[PDB]
């Protein structure tokens, strides 16, 4: 008859690929979920069906027993014996660990159970409940800790493969420090293990005010009496409309990033996000 | 949807692991290092392209039903097997400012393939 690869949520064979093809023929294999049509009807009665129904009616479920089944890490039957291969993380070989996703896990199989379902790109990252500050971490052998924009800890192999060029391979550290190469910053950033910031383009000078500071890319410098330096930011971005309300360094609360870009931009000075939500003393 | 296992020869999605080194985003991506992005590959024939299950099915069907009788600018545009569902992936990089940003890039990888 006919041969399919999937039975729908609601039954009905779907995903046909071998027509004119007896059952025990299409049923021999160990790859499960493979179901069966018993009738030949190549005409668009077939097309029809995908509409009228989840699909092909009178589907036939090859195995109702993990008989000759096959599936990368194992089978378990259960319910209306609808044997579904699931998750055989295989345990043995300690910890209550963190996740490369940022989420915490009570332990590793914990995770291996998850890496099974969706993300196989799901890593580990390091042992122990996940952290929001480089406070901790041995980082597997050789992998500097660092911190996200949300201020969170991650471990990594700093890439040390890339030093020197160039007209202006040559840029200014938000920490002062003239860096020689775009990737070079990346390096000292990583070594420092925290966002430093491209203060702006070119070699650094001591100036005392934004005017003085050039700026291409059409960014617009802004200053910060904090350390006393300039900063070549980008204000050409708008929003008037996800979201979030935050409270900032100067002693004020706002709306989105969007909210106070031109806060600083349109006005003067650079600002930093004190914290999310509001903050106040009544 | 699909699983490109066995001697399959249709629009199945073959697993594939991409190294940022191997392409050179090594440097502007922090981790994750590499990862699987896979893709779509296989012949896109007849009584099967509308059977795909994929989003692109019914339409694809209502199309071929044309070139079947070599009609307009159609007899010579083959249904090629493509992606029809892609979940996003969260990573880590230097935004244009060289700061450190964790975001989830949408449809960075392929859930299902389909005929078209």
């Amino acid at each position: 008859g006919n041969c399919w690869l999937r039975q729908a949520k609601n039954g009905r064979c779907q995903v046909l690929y071998k027509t004119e093809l007896s059952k025990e023929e299409c049923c021999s294999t160990g790859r499960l979920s493979t179901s069966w049509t018993e009738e030949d009807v190549n005409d668009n009665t077939l097309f029809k069906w995908m509409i009228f129904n989840g699909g092909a009616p009178n589907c036939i479920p090859c195995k109702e027993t993990c008989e000759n089944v096959d599936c990368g890490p194992k089978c378990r039957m259960n319910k209306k014996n609808k044997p579904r291969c699931v998750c055989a993380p295989d345990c043995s070989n300690k910890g209550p660990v963190c996740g490369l996703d940022g989420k915490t896990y009570r332990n590793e199989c914990a995770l291996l159970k998850a890496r099974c379902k969706e993300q196989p790109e799901l890593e580990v990252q390091y042992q122990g409940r996940c952290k929001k500050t480089c406070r901790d971490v041995f980082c597997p052998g050789s992998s500097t800790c660092v911190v996200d924009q949300t201020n969170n800890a991650y471990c990594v192999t700093c890439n040390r493969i890339c030093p020197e060029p160039s007209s202006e391979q040559y840029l200014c550290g938000n920490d002062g420090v003239t860096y020689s190469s775009a990737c070079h910053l990346r390096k000292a950033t990583c070594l420092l293990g925290r966002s430093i910031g491209l203060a702006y383009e070119g070699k650094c000078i001591k100036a005392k005010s934004c005017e003085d500071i050039q700026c291409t890319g059409g960014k617009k410098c802004l200053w910060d009496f904090k350390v006393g330096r300039g900063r070549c930011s980008l204000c050409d971005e708008l929003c008037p409309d996800s979201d979030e309300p935050v409270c900032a360094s100067d002693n004020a609360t706002y709306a989105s990033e969007c909210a106070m870009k031109e806060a600083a931009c349109s006005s003067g000075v650079l600002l930093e996000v004190k914290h999310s939500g509001s903050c106040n003393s009544i | 949807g699909l699983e490109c296992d066995g001697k399959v020869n249709i629009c199945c999605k073959k697993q594939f692991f991409v190294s940022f080194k191997d392409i050179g985003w090594n440097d502007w991506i922090i981790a994750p290092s590499g990862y699987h992005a896979n893709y779509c590959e296989g012949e896109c024939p007849s009584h099967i392209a509308g059977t795909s299950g994929s989003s692109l099915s019914f339409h694809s069907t209502v199309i071929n039903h044309y070139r079947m009788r070599g009609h307009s600018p159609f007899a010579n545009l083959k249904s090629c097997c493509v992606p029809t569902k892609l979940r996003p992936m969260s990573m880590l990089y230097y935004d244009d400012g060289q700061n450190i940003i964790k975001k989830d890039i949408q449809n960075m990888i392929v859930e299902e393939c389909g005929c078209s």
Partner: peptide
């Protein structure tokens, strides 16, 4: 105490 290098967006 600590710090908080400015940002891009969210």
């Amino acid at each position: 105490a600590a710090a908080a290098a400015a940002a891009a967006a969210a």
